Design a protein around this ligand. Structure first.
Ligand SMILES: [Zn+2]
Ligand SMILES: [Zn+2]
Ligand SMILES: [Zn+2]
Ligand SMILES: [Zn+2]
Lengths: 263, 255, 263, 255
């Protein structure tokens, strides 16, 4: 099946930033024709550690910006919702509605997303065991979702640290397509001052592990200049490095593919 | 005074709340050194299964809780799950509770603080004790004056929670601390036998109050059936923690 | 039953240090007559993180020093062994033979201790679940041990951190007397540079929790001047604070005792 | 060359070692790009139960291993549990293995280093990746020249281990890194279905070798029966990791 690559700047810092990243993603989509690219960006960071951190410019602005990306580049779109009422307006532009990790058990949010008819991607909560995502998929199916994804983004491992238990990939594949979040998985929750920390040096090696184990897609946040990002400045991948990373995972996926176990 | 938040996990019926409210009212009259707060959820918005009991809705819930407050004169507390619910709930709830999974949702916290009511935040199973400082700050920014942080366990491997008692003195630096005696022993995805021993630990360490879900017939409860405390055992546990607190309080560290 | 208090300097820095601490422990044993005091000190720190850290002055010197303490003060003695051959010589002075946490599964070490006829205290490994200590007690009984203790000293919680799951106390009590290690439970494994870290501010509160939950004794390392200790300088309790801590736990134990559940 | 350490968990008999040694010898001739090392323990010194299989003793063990080395010309590796065992084991063992629970026992490490043989230390389930730097230093101080660190999982809650692949690049800073594919999926106090996928992960990330326990009839093994790899599946897995390594190696980060 076609491999999915969900990528984009963490937050919608401005419509200009989006178009700049979208342009590169469009270029890569023309090169890597065997990949289905989905542009991602959050119109709101509703769970920042600090009240002083950047959140966004509002739902209205964000949807408008994402719509511009889809219009100008013909790219599929995905963004996350935080309360049930946002599902309807967001579904107007989003091809895939994303459910935040902390909210993966909020029944009404899941139901709100499912009834839009759009695909739904649920970030696996840091508190959830792999086998407990079965009921998450069940809720979505109950709500009408026909295209469901589960995203591995790390599990709570002691304080301010996450570990990726790759056994989750084959387990979750039993009931949904699986995506590996290469950037949030290496972040150190509340690691820094009133902000999240992260170790970019592990992004690439862990993504290689994900494709070797076997997944249906990868999720990566990318920014022209990560150091200047308003969110996840420590983990967002430099846009110039995206091409090489994608090429590498396609190569590893190809050679490992014949060994992927049947679920 | 020492805070004791208790009541049935979910508002299974106005009838159930009244029966429990009566016992809590009696204990309230027997223990003047304690401030009792009646708790019950109008909606279990985060159940694991879509086929599990959620409740009868916000209106039916706020109505039943109002009946408890008016009939017994007890303070009330219930949890909210989305921002719009803060206002209507604040009509009856003296303390607005923020669910553990939602402790980082800025709009929910701000919505609760705006009501002018006290706010009790369940510490997420993914949060470190020191990470709660930011939670309190959000609430203060939102205008909250009476703020509580509730210890309810931390993710420890899969389908298990551990209570790191170091969290009590750490969180006390920025808020009043409550120990959730029933959810802390629950196995996500629990053991009633550990409820009492851990609550004894909490008061020996030092906290500002305890949270306990209680039900007349726990095994018949529509939620947390394996962990809700039988109503008849509530008095004994309260007396026990008051006695332990009386002796141990001499050693509670300053700030 | 008589409450057990195992205390002493972490390592046998010198025979003089031992006698100084022993003198205070003897004084407290005369005051707290309802407590059974056991003097503890390691003749060897065989598991230091760094090859450059203090280990000790040898088994011969240590046993001689411990014997002096028992002779001069009439105090019971306990020390830990690291290899089977040490059980015999150590049993000549030790009333309780201690089994290190990392070695709680080494069958021959356990058997070596059991056949000496002495009491055996096993530190629960940081990797062991409470219910898995049942087989540890089984091995000891198989080897002839008639007086067995299991010591709670924390469990691996993420990297360089330990958490105390107090549910372990009532669980382990099902098959052995339980001791709470108040000082090692708050140490941060490899936290510092080539050494262990620790948070002394949590020693007292956690010990209060242990007695409130219910245990058969407490283990505390104490030193005249912790800051100068050659091992566990961050967690050893100042000797001057021992009296107050013991008084406090006896008071909390008394008031909580009527509520201790029957196993 | 890439290292592949394989063999039956325990020396159940000289007979068993020979049968496994034959297959490993064959693979050794088929894969010249790989250095095979035959492994088997003469004693399971840390079994959970006193009634479980330990072995036939050190002498019988060193004897059987010597037979494998002489008959097939394969390098040998076995683990030691107490200092005195280093010398006699070094007579046949090319690489002396240090058990995970004993990775901090200074005298065992020094005893192994003194033999002049290579030393492979299983990373304790309680150790952080960076904590292994000190382990290597002890060995260097003891005179060790060829040093390996083996990833075999980290304590994750109770009766479960997780493999934090970040450990591979971290440990590589001070030693050659080996990934233990069979013990990493074991549930202390395991799932064979996860052995292959995680070994693929290990080579994609980048390691210097893999460790795998294999047995003709795993379900009949006297130890690690639930995790030992069936002998017949060994060739396929090796070919697979060589292919993945060939492609992925282009991206292994420097130092
Ligand atoms: Zn992000
Ligand atoms: Zn409940
Ligand atoms: Zn010590
Ligand atoms: Zn094995």
């Amino acid at each position: 099946e076609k491999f999915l690559v969900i990528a984009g700047p963490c937050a919608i810092e401005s419509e200009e930033l989006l178009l700049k990243v979208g342009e590169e993603i469009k270029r890569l989509s023309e090169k890597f024709k065997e990949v289905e690219f989905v542009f991602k960006s959050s119109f709101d960071k509703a769970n920042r550690s600090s009240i002083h951190s950047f959140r966004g410019h509002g739902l209205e602005y964000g949807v408008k910006a994402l719509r511009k990306v889809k219009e100008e580049f013909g790219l599929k779109i995905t963004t996350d919702i935080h309360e049930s009422w946002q599902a309807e307006p967001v579904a107007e532009v989003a091809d895939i509605i994303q459910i935040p990790a902390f909210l993966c058990r909020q029944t009404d949010l899941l139901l709100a997303a499912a009834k839009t008819g759009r695909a739904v991607n649920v970030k696996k909560g840091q508190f959830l065991a792999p086998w407990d995502t079965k009921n998450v998929v069940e809720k979505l199916k109950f709500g009408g979702a026909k295209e469901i994804y589960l995203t591995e983004r790390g599990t709570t491992f002691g304080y301010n640290n996450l570990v990726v238990d790759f056994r989750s990939l084959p387990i979750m594949k039993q009931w949904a397509k699986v995506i590996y979040d290469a950037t949030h998985s290496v972040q150190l929750p509340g690691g820094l001052g009133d902000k999240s920390g992260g170790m970019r040096e592990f992004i690439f090696p862990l993504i290689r592990a994900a494709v070797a184990v076997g997944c249906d897609g990868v999720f990566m946040e990318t920014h022209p200049e990560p150091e200047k990002a308003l969110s996840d400045a420590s983990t967002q991948l430099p846009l110039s490095q995206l091409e090489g990373i994608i090429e590498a995972i396609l190569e590893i996926r190809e050679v490992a593919s014949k060994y992927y176990e049947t679920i």
